[PDB]
Design a binder for this molecule. Sequence first.
Ligand SMILES: Nc1nc2c(ncn2[C@@H]2O[C@H](COP(=O)(O)OP(=O)(O)OP(=O)(O)O)[C@@H](O)[C@H]2O)c(=O)[nH]1
Ligand SMILES: [Mg+2]
Ligand SMILES: [Mg+2]
Ligand SMILES: [Mg+2]
Ligand SMILES: [Mg+2]
Ligand SMILES: [Mg+2]
Ligand SMILES: [Mg+2]
Ligand SMILES: [Mg+2]
Ligand SMILES: [Mg+2]
Ligand SMILES: [Mg+2]
Ligand SMILES: [Mg+2]
Ligand SMILES: [Mg+2]
Ligand SMILES: [Mg+2]
Ligand SMILES: [Mg+2]
Ligand SMILES: [Mg+2]
Ligand SMILES: [Mg+2]
Ligand SMILES: [Mg+2]
Ligand SMILES: [Mg+2]
Ligand SMILES: [Mg+2]
Ligand SMILES: [Mg+2]
Ligand SMILES: [Mg+2]
Ligand SMILES: [Mg+2]
Ligand SMILES: [Mg+2]
Ligand SMILES: [Mg+2]
Ligand SMILES: [Mg+2]
Ligand SMILES: [Mg+2]
Ligand SMILES: [Mg+2]
Ligand SMILES: [Mg+2]
Ligand SMILES: [Mg+2]
Ligand SMILES: [Mg+2]
Ligand SMILES: [Mg+2]
Ligand SMILES: [Mg+2]
Ligand SMILES: [Mg+2]
Ligand SMILES: [Mg+2]
Ligand SMILES: [Mg+2]
Ligand SMILES: [Mg+2]
Ligand SMILES: [Mg+2]
Ligand SMILES: [Mg+2]
Ligand SMILES: [Mg+2]
Ligand SMILES: [Mg+2]
Ligand SMILES: [Mg+2]
Ligand SMILES: [Mg+2]
Ligand SMILES: [Mg+2]
Ligand SMILES: [Mg+2]
Ligand SMILES: [Mg+2]
Ligand SMILES: [Mg+2]
Ligand SMILES: [Mg+2]
Ligand SMILES: [Mg+2]
Ligand SMILES: [Mg+2]
Ligand SMILES: [Mg+2]
Ligand SMILES: [Mg+2]
Ligand SMILES: [Mg+2]
Ligand SMILES: [Mg+2]
Ligand SMILES: [Mg+2]
Ligand SMILES: [Mg+2]
Ligand SMILES: [Mg+2]
Ligand SMILES: [Mg+2]
Ligand SMILES: [Mg+2]
Ligand SMILES: [Mg+2]
Ligand SMILES: [Mg+2]
Ligand SMILES: [Mg+2]
Ligand SMILES: [Mg+2]
Ligand SMILES: [Mg+2]
Ligand SMILES: [Mg+2]
Ligand SMILES: [Mg+2]
Ligand SMILES: [Mg+2]
Ligand SMILES: [Mg+2]
Ligand SMILES: [Mg+2]
Ligand SMILES: [Mg+2]
Ligand SMILES: [Mg+2]
Ligand SMILES: [Mg+2]
Ligand SMILES: [Mg+2]
Ligand SMILES: [Mg+2]
Ligand SMILES: [Mg+2]
Ligand SMILES: [Mg+2]
Ligand SMILES: [Mg+2]
Ligand SMILES: [Mg+2]
Ligand SMILES: [Mg+2]
Ligand SMILES: [Mg+2]
Ligand SMILES: [Mg+2]
Ligand SMILES: [Mg+2]
Ligand SMILES: [Mg+2]
Ligand SMILES: [Mg+2]
Ligand SMILES: [Mg+2]
Ligand SMILES: [Mg+2]
Ligand SMILES: [Mg+2]
Ligand SMILES: [Mg+2]
Ligand SMILES: [Mg+2]
Ligand SMILES: [Mg+2]
Ligand SMILES: [Mg+2]
Ligand SMILES: [Mg+2]
Ligand SMILES: [Mg+2]
Ligand SMILES: [Mg+2]
Ligand SMILES: [Mg+2]
Ligand SMILES: [Mg+2]
Ligand SMILES: [Mg+2]
Ligand SMILES: [Mg+2]
Ligand SMILES: [Mg+2]
Ligand SMILES: [Mg+2]
Ligand SMILES: [Mg+2]
Ligand SMILES: [Mg+2]
Ligand SMILES: [Mg+2]
Ligand SMILES: [Mg+2]
Ligand SMILES: [Mg+2]
Ligand SMILES: [Mg+2]
Ligand SMILES: [Mg+2]
Ligand SMILES: [Mg+2]
Ligand SMILES: [Mg+2]
Ligand SMILES: [Mg+2]
Ligand SMILES: [Mg+2]
Ligand SMILES: [Mg+2]
Ligand SMILES: [Mg+2]
Ligand SMILES: [Mg+2]
Ligand SMILES: [Mg+2]
Ligand SMILES: [Mg+2]
Ligand SMILES: [Mg+2]
Ligand SMILES: [Mg+2]
Ligand SMILES: [Mg+2]
Ligand SMILES: [Mg+2]
Ligand SMILES: [Mg+2]
Ligand SMILES: [Mg+2]
Ligand SMILES: [Mg+2]
Ligand SMILES: [Mg+2]
Ligand SMILES: [Mg+2]
Ligand SMILES: [Mg+2]
Ligand SMILES: [Mg+2]
Ligand SMILES: [Mg+2]
Ligand SMILES: [Mg+2]
Ligand SMILES: [Mg+2]
Ligand SMILES: [Mg+2]
Ligand SMILES: [Mg+2]
Ligand SMILES: [Mg+2]
Ligand SMILES: [Mg+2]
Ligand SMILES: [Mg+2]
Ligand SMILES: [Mg+2]
Ligand SMILES: [Mg+2]
Ligand SMILES: [Mg+2]
Ligand SMILES: [Mg+2]
Ligand SMILES: [Mg+2]
Ligand SMILES: [Mg+2]
Ligand SMILES: [Mg+2]
Ligand SMILES: [Mg+2]
Lengths: 205, 60, 82, 85, 393
Amino acid sequence: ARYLGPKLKLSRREGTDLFLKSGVRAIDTKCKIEQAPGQHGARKPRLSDYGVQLREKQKVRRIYGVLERQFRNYYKEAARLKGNTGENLLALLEGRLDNVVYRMGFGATRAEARQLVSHKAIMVNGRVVNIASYQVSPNDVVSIREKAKKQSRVKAALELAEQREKPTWLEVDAGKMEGTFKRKPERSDLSADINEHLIVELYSK
Amino acid sequence: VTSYIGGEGHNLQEHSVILIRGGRVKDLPGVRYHTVRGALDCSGVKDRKQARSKYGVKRP
Amino acid sequence: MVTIRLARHGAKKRPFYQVVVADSRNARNGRFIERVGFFNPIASEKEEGTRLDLDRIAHWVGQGATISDRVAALIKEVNKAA
Amino acid sequence: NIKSAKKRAIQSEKARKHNASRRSMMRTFIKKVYAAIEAGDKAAAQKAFNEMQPIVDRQAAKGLIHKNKAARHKANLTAQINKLA
Amino acid sequence: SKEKFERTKPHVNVGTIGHVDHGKTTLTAAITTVLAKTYGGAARAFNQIDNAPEEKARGITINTSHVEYDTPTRHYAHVDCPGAADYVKNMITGAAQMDGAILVVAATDGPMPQTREHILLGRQVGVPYIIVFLNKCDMVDDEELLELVEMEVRELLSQYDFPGDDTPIVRGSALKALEGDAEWEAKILELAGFLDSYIPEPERAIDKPFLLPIEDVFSISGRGTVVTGRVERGIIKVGEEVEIVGIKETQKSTCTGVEMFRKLLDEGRAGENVGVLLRGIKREEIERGQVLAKPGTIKPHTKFESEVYILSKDEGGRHTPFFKGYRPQFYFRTTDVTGTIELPEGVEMVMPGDNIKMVVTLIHPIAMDDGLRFAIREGGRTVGAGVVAKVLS
RNA sequence: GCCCGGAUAGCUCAGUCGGUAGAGCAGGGGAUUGAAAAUCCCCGUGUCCUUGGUUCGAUUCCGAGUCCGGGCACCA
RNA sequence: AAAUUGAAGAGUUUGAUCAUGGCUCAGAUUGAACGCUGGCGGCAGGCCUAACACAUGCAAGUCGAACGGUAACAGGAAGAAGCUUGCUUCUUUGCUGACGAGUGGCGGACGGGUGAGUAAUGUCUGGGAAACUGCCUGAUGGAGGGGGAUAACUACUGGAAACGGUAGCUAAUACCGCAUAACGUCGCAAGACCAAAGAGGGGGACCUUCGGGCCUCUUGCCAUCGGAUGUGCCCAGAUGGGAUUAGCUAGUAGGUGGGGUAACGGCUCACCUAGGCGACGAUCCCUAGCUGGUCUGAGAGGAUGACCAGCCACACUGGAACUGAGACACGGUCCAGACUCCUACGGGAGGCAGCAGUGGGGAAUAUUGCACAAUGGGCGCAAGCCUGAUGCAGCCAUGCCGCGUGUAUGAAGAAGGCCUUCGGGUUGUAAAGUACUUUCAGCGGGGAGGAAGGGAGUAAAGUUAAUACCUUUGCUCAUUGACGUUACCCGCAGAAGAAGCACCGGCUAACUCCGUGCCAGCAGCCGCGGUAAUACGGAGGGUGCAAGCGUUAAUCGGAAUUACUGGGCGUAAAGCGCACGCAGGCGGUUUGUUAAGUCAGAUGUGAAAUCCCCGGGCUCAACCUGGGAACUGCAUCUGAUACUGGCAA
Ligand SMILES: Nc1nc2c(ncn2[C@@H]2O[C@H](COP(=O)(O)OP(=O)(O)OP(=O)(O)O)[C@@H](O)[C@H]2O)c(=O)[nH]1
Ligand SMILES: [Mg+2]
Ligand SMILES: [Mg+2]
Ligand SMILES: [Mg+2]
Ligand SMILES: [Mg+2]
Ligand SMILES: [Mg+2]
Ligand SMILES: [Mg+2]
Ligand SMILES: [Mg+2]
Ligand SMILES: [Mg+2]
Ligand SMILES: [Mg+2]
Ligand SMILES: [Mg+2]
Ligand SMILES: [Mg+2]
Ligand SMILES: [Mg+2]
Ligand SMILES: [Mg+2]
Ligand SMILES: [Mg+2]
Ligand SMILES: [Mg+2]
Ligand SMILES: [Mg+2]
Ligand SMILES: [Mg+2]
Ligand SMILES: [Mg+2]
Ligand SMILES: [Mg+2]
Ligand SMILES: [Mg+2]
Ligand SMILES: [Mg+2]
Ligand SMILES: [Mg+2]
Ligand SMILES: [Mg+2]
Ligand SMILES: [Mg+2]
Ligand SMILES: [Mg+2]
Ligand SMILES: [Mg+2]
Ligand SMILES: [Mg+2]
Ligand SMILES: [Mg+2]
Ligand SMILES: [Mg+2]
Ligand SMILES: [Mg+2]
Ligand SMILES: [Mg+2]
Ligand SMILES: [Mg+2]
Ligand SMILES: [Mg+2]
Ligand SMILES: [Mg+2]
Ligand SMILES: [Mg+2]
Ligand SMILES: [Mg+2]
Ligand SMILES: [Mg+2]
Ligand SMILES: [Mg+2]
Ligand SMILES: [Mg+2]
Ligand SMILES: [Mg+2]
Ligand SMILES: [Mg+2]
Ligand SMILES: [Mg+2]
Ligand SMILES: [Mg+2]
Ligand SMILES: [Mg+2]
Ligand SMILES: [Mg+2]
Ligand SMILES: [Mg+2]
Ligand SMILES: [Mg+2]
Ligand SMILES: [Mg+2]
Ligand SMILES: [Mg+2]
Ligand SMILES: [Mg+2]
Ligand SMILES: [Mg+2]
Ligand SMILES: [Mg+2]
Ligand SMILES: [Mg+2]
Ligand SMILES: [Mg+2]
Ligand SMILES: [Mg+2]
Ligand SMILES: [Mg+2]
Ligand SMILES: [Mg+2]
Ligand SMILES: [Mg+2]
Ligand SMILES: [Mg+2]
Ligand SMILES: [Mg+2]
Ligand SMILES: [Mg+2]
Ligand SMILES: [Mg+2]
Ligand SMILES: [Mg+2]
Ligand SMILES: [Mg+2]
Ligand SMILES: [Mg+2]
Ligand SMILES: [Mg+2]
Ligand SMILES: [Mg+2]
Ligand SMILES: [Mg+2]
Ligand SMILES: [Mg+2]
Ligand SMILES: [Mg+2]
Ligand SMILES: [Mg+2]
Ligand SMILES: [Mg+2]
Ligand SMILES: [Mg+2]
Ligand SMILES: [Mg+2]
Ligand SMILES: [Mg+2]
Ligand SMILES: [Mg+2]
Ligand SMILES: [Mg+2]
Ligand SMILES: [Mg+2]
Ligand SMILES: [Mg+2]
Ligand SMILES: [Mg+2]
Ligand SMILES: [Mg+2]
Ligand SMILES: [Mg+2]
Ligand SMILES: [Mg+2]
Ligand SMILES: [Mg+2]
Ligand SMILES: [Mg+2]
Ligand SMILES: [Mg+2]
Ligand SMILES: [Mg+2]
Ligand SMILES: [Mg+2]
Ligand SMILES: [Mg+2]
Ligand SMILES: [Mg+2]
Ligand SMILES: [Mg+2]
Ligand SMILES: [Mg+2]
Ligand SMILES: [Mg+2]
Ligand SMILES: [Mg+2]
Ligand SMILES: [Mg+2]
Ligand SMILES: [Mg+2]
Ligand SMILES: [Mg+2]
Ligand SMILES: [Mg+2]
Ligand SMILES: [Mg+2]
Ligand SMILES: [Mg+2]
Ligand SMILES: [Mg+2]
Ligand SMILES: [Mg+2]
Ligand SMILES: [Mg+2]
Ligand SMILES: [Mg+2]
Ligand SMILES: [Mg+2]
Ligand SMILES: [Mg+2]
Ligand SMILES: [Mg+2]
Ligand SMILES: [Mg+2]
Ligand SMILES: [Mg+2]
Ligand SMILES: [Mg+2]
Ligand SMILES: [Mg+2]
Ligand SMILES: [Mg+2]
Ligand SMILES: [Mg+2]
Ligand SMILES: [Mg+2]
Ligand SMILES: [Mg+2]
Ligand SMILES: [Mg+2]
Ligand SMILES: [Mg+2]
Ligand SMILES: [Mg+2]
Ligand SMILES: [Mg+2]
Ligand SMILES: [Mg+2]
Ligand SMILES: [Mg+2]
Ligand SMILES: [Mg+2]
Ligand SMILES: [Mg+2]
Ligand SMILES: [Mg+2]
Ligand SMILES: [Mg+2]
Ligand SMILES: [Mg+2]
Ligand SMILES: [Mg+2]
Ligand SMILES: [Mg+2]
Ligand SMILES: [Mg+2]
Ligand SMILES: [Mg+2]
Ligand SMILES: [Mg+2]
Ligand SMILES: [Mg+2]
Ligand SMILES: [Mg+2]
Ligand SMILES: [Mg+2]
Ligand SMILES: [Mg+2]
Ligand SMILES: [Mg+2]
Ligand SMILES: [Mg+2]
Ligand SMILES: [Mg+2]
Ligand SMILES: [Mg+2]
Ligand SMILES: [Mg+2]
Ligand SMILES: [Mg+2]
């Protein structure tokens, strides 16, 4: 169901910073990033056309914390929806509750946001929700319950979110731990680096 | 028919009831099947660790 | 004898009755002439719940179709009751 | 057999003893008309037809004979009387 | 399997013991017709105790047959043993579950070699009490000859470590009580009184968790495979989880009906022979020797340390030394099993009549715990009793 | 539950009525030709299916077992 | 508003090449199986072979308002006998309520199960009728007088049993007269002919001969004519493969006449004619339930028809009918055969392709589950009682979906492993430790919604002679859950209980080395392995996938490698040796004329589910579900008549 392994190892293999081990400190400089995937990171890969696609797919999975079976289902939904197939893949991932909770600032990492969702802390439209893959509808109000409000893990994690870019599509109160998911996320608003194109190709064959 | 006994060593002899799966060897002309190691009287291969679903061996 | 009865569809522990005009001999879920609305017992206080097309009921009950114990009361529920 | 509604296995045995008797009675009275037809003028045939007409209609009403069976046994049989004699 | 067995009167597991062709099985036939006539229980006959081709053309019994005769005080449950030298293996299962035996020595022949072998197997396994019965009497019309046989039985029991003189010796012909002789019917009614008086109420273990050794597996065109045996400890409720442990490996199961001589039961209590029914198990895969335990209580083992007491010539056993590689038969609860011996360091040879511990690797695994009693046998005779010390596997 | 047969070095078989078991084919310390048809030398290379007993001494005589072969039964 | 956004290649012939062309692989799948590791929930699923043989419990009963029964049973009332005079014994009483048995009525033909047969009798769409239709219902109103008998019960026997006989006796809505008859049946019409059953809840008035005469109402019973409903038939096309099956066929093909069918018909007969089918595949052969759909595909197609739903077919194997509104009848009948059982050797029972269960054959596949609470379904005037229908309790990762085996910080870049150019690298922020949360499991307490009703009493409105009963509607009562220690909620304790198995030369993301030296083995293809291996075992980093993953079988895909969309035939496989020519396919050209094709429109229909879009509903999700589109149809009816055909000049 979850990875629960060495998280920063995934970032080296992929190369870029995946925000798995983001947390309290801003920058790591604490893994020999890029040049050490495993025992043979010095080996320059040839890297085929199937490779680059499969690396790009694994990047987007490992960022959002999703497995192949559930990720393949997002592609199937993304294809059936109107407009661009690539933009839908990412938009459906960004609409996940564990992703929204991370983007609100209620969690130093996305795994923390997932557990915070799982453990009955998160609540939306006056209803408790346990599911990380809960598709957050446009015009919703995610929030933390009064029992687990202002605990140790959340207040330190919300201060990290000030250093972050902060999305335009959602808004956060910050005083009373209350969020507001407004519109669906745009392509140009977020990332500007992870290529959807190559993921659309991989599943088509 | 004839069936190839995979792995190193075996407990098959004379009779002994064995389970047979499909799959040619591509070497022995005529042989077009494999004996499933682990199933029925055909025991697992002794001292195999990697790839033990094939060859029917338990945990270490 | 044609009769207006509930068909019972829906998942386990979550019934959804398809009130339907069928022959008495035919099975519960099987053969029918035409479906005439529905009933949802686990709908609760919200938007939808029970819908029953009363114009089609007059076409069969007026002719000669018996109404079952439940469908007779869902007529009593939709008309007046409140 | 493994039912208390076996009653119907006898009850129906009791039925056909009676049901064959009234049926056989009718078809003998119809045979009496067909016997009169062949070599007989407009007299003996219509007497036999006047006798069986009440008997065939009665058995039609009880559910032994269907009303169409009875209708033919008049229709085709009156034509034998009408055409020949 | 229709009438419900009402739990009234204490259950006691009785059985006949004695020489070959000594009126051992015929005693069981006499006890049924005598008790059923006067008191008013179920009748039965001498045929149903032993039919088949094997016990007709020959006449000799092999299978441990069972009988259920009732009395005012107690509800007895008979276990007729085979008796011959060839049938000692299936006898020990019948003799282990037996609480209080009925010895059968006869007034014409007297004590014989098997009688000594039977009582030898009774002590080491578990036979607390024993009662003598002279099973001929009428043939030799004499006062002095019949009474001289009674003396040698008192000698045998006292020589082999039983009460001997205290045991109530009874006389009576089995064939005479089968028909309807008023003097001989009353004399076997006296044996029923001796069973009540001498043998006390047996001590059960209805507290510590469920275990049941299997004596004989059936495939009842009924329900499925059925297993018979005395419940050694605990209870058996219907629709309860039961783990079958012993030979081969281990299999999960559930009880779906306990019974007592073709009659229904709710709770199969300890210390009584019951036919427990198993769900989803074939006739071949489950075999004799395995035990019906509660899940988690017992685990099958193929290696164990054990304090073995080897017997000498006087007690009845080996008379020569032996070294590692010796393979005798280890009789645990019901079945026997072969196993190689590995002696401790600083012990060159095991002399007869000696107390030592030793590791024993068995060829078949059997369910066992610390403090389990067993009796070693080899070559149609006993070798040494002992107890389990430590588990290894 | 009980009656019977079967097992001999890596494989296929000889040998026994107590005198301590051998043959080919095998294979190995073994030489030829980058490996080689034909060559040489060389060992048996052994829990006599396992274990105990009668015994000076058991493959061999007598119990008990192993797994496998085929045979006859019992229905809580 | 929307209703499709959907089309990848690679290895492999050669010294190298381009082509041709096979071979193999990457992805989807599933009634899967086995293998390895073996924690959860939700909605599903689960003998494909032997349509094999079956023990044990069950699966269709039900009605006292049809009637004898003064009752088998359990219990009140007039009276009796014991004696603790109300404690006990006990005969009468329709008399206490009901009901074992029985005739009756209506159900058992529906509802469940399985594909043996079936290549058309069947199935699909579209048609037509020449029909019947219990119970539902719209009219037309009758519904009057009788009489044998007949079980049960006796009585008396026969039989080992199953199951009878003979003598009475009696009951009914049972059963047959009877008068009675229509817009009914028959006839050219005049005529003739044709039916029924009473119950039950209540009653003022007057008959009481007390059985109550008699009025009310509710229901039954009839008579056709019409509904609605199923069912029977019939025609059109469609519905597998084979020509190494081209001839088949005598009730065969048609006619007249008789019989029979609910209905028409060689359905069946007698005679008459000599046909009929057939190259747009008869015949014979092999295989096969069919469909909605399912899987796959860019789509066309290809394959398939488990689960759910419609239709057919079959019930130990071959027959036949009886009864019925409906059967030529899964748990009716009677034969016949084979197979097990019982016996007094004479004759008897006998049907799991219901639901559990079992033995078998097998790669393989459930509980001798609990309940009518629920929607049905049966009978009933209602309560009811029956139900393996249905729901649901368990089992199995066989699956689909969603959860979890924590989530931050953490450098001495520790130890240990593995590699090394012995400098170090790597395992690795991995772990240890520090921040903490504590969804699931586990405990302890709250607790919905599936429940509509049914029942007992009340005020009124109908009904009527009547403030009575009856019918209807408000209104007060106490209740109805197999699931169920429920869904869901809240407190508790402490990361505590919680992992996978592939492969890693190439194709295909992933290599270092100790190698078992063409031995052991690998392998899906090319190929590896012969004292320095990314291709074998092993340790070991990863690569990869997750409660599953592999291997295997099976269908499609890629395969434009059966090509209609969409290939070819000089030399790669492939132009008959060359003509003539009927059937068939195609056909120059201008004016008419039709409307077959063709297109446009319209109406009917294309079952529901499924798919799709828009939605909604369960903590989200699978899942369920409201509403539209679609179902490449077909049918008709009316129009364009350019183009094709026909009929013209
Ligand atoms: N004279 C006499 N003979 C008796 C009596 N009881 C039994 N028997 C005989 O003993 C025999 C019975 O032997 P059992 O030992 O009971 O039979 P069994 O147990 O099957 O025999 P095994 O199995 O060989 O021990 C019969 O043949 C009888 O004739 C008795 O009271 N008197
Ligand atoms: Mg999952
Ligand atoms: Mg694709
Ligand atoms: Mg293959
Ligand atoms: Mg491999
Ligand atoms: Mg609610
Ligand atoms: Mg009802
Ligand atoms: Mg006759
Ligand atoms: Mg006659
Ligand atoms: Mg008349
Ligand atoms: Mg009739
Ligand atoms: Mg449009
Ligand atoms: Mg696609
Ligand atoms: Mg080459
Ligand atoms: Mg060449
Ligand atoms: Mg499996
Ligand atoms: Mg397995
Ligand atoms: Mg398990
Ligand atoms: Mg389910
Ligand atoms: Mg089948
Ligand atoms: Mg078949
Ligand atoms: Mg078959
Ligand atoms: Mg069968
Ligand atoms: Mg019973
Ligand atoms: Mg039965
Ligand atoms: Mg009455
Ligand atoms: Mg009755
Ligand atoms: Mg039937
Ligand atoms: Mg049928
Ligand atoms: Mg069905
Ligand atoms: Mg049916
Ligand atoms: Mg089934
Ligand atoms: Mg099927
Ligand atoms: Mg089918
Ligand atoms: Mg047809
Ligand atoms: Mg038909
Ligand atoms: Mg039509
Ligand atoms: Mg009509
Ligand atoms: Mg009727
Ligand atoms: Mg009827
Ligand atoms: Mg009628
Ligand atoms: Mg009416
Ligand atoms: Mg009118
Ligand atoms: Mg009028
Ligand atoms: Mg009227
Ligand atoms: Mg009369
Ligand atoms: Mg009379
Ligand atoms: Mg008579
Ligand atoms: Mg008479
Ligand atoms: Mg009378
Ligand atoms: Mg009368
Ligand atoms: Mg009548
Ligand atoms: Mg008259
Ligand atoms: Mg008149
Ligand atoms: Mg007319
Ligand atoms: Mg009358
Ligand atoms: Mg009246
Ligand atoms: Mg009355
Ligand atoms: Mg009157
Ligand atoms: Mg119709
Ligand atoms: Mg003819
Ligand atoms: Mg008919
Ligand atoms: Mg394609
Ligand atoms: Mg098909
Ligand atoms: Mg099926
Ligand atoms: Mg089902
Ligand atoms: Mg179905
Ligand atoms: Mg049909
Ligand atoms: Mg038949
Ligand atoms: Mg037939
Ligand atoms: Mg036929
Ligand atoms: Mg009829
Ligand atoms: Mg019919
Ligand atoms: Mg039929
Ligand atoms: Mg027929
Ligand atoms: Mg049946
Ligand atoms: Mg027969
Ligand atoms: Mg039976
Ligand atoms: Mg039966
Ligand atoms: Mg079954
Ligand atoms: Mg089975
Ligand atoms: Mg098998
Ligand atoms: Mg049960
Ligand atoms: Mg039940
Ligand atoms: Mg029941
Ligand atoms: Mg009940
Ligand atoms: Mg109840
Ligand atoms: Mg009901
Ligand atoms: Mg009523
Ligand atoms: Mg019942
Ligand atoms: Mg499980
Ligand atoms: Mg899906
Ligand atoms: Mg620790
Ligand atoms: Mg708990
Ligand atoms: Mg709620
Ligand atoms: Mg409720
Ligand atoms: Mg209510
Ligand atoms: Mg409610
Ligand atoms: Mg009421
Ligand atoms: Mg009252
Ligand atoms: Mg209850
Ligand atoms: Mg309960
Ligand atoms: Mg609780
Ligand atoms: Mg729910
Ligand atoms: Mg803590
Ligand atoms: Mg701790
Ligand atoms: Mg070699
Ligand atoms: Mg393959
Ligand atoms: Mg080296
Ligand atoms: Mg490889
Ligand atoms: Mg390797
Ligand atoms: Mg590893
Ligand atoms: Mg698989
Ligand atoms: Mg193609
Ligand atoms: Mg080509
Ligand atoms: Mg050429
Ligand atoms: Mg060529
Ligand atoms: Mg050629
Ligand atoms: Mg040419
Ligand atoms: Mg031509
Ligand atoms: Mg043409
Ligand atoms: Mg032209
Ligand atoms: Mg032409
Ligand atoms: Mg046209
Ligand atoms: Mg058109
Ligand atoms: Mg339309
Ligand atoms: Mg549809
Ligand atoms: Mg829909
Ligand atoms: Mg939306
Ligand atoms: Mg939705
Ligand atoms: Mg929703
Ligand atoms: Mg909602
Ligand atoms: Mg769906
Ligand atoms: Mg719809
Ligand atoms: Mg629509
Ligand atoms: Mg449109
Ligand atoms: Mg369309
Ligand atoms: Mg479609
Ligand atoms: Mg026109
Ligand atoms: Mg023109
Ligand atoms: Mg024009
Ligand atoms: Mg033209």
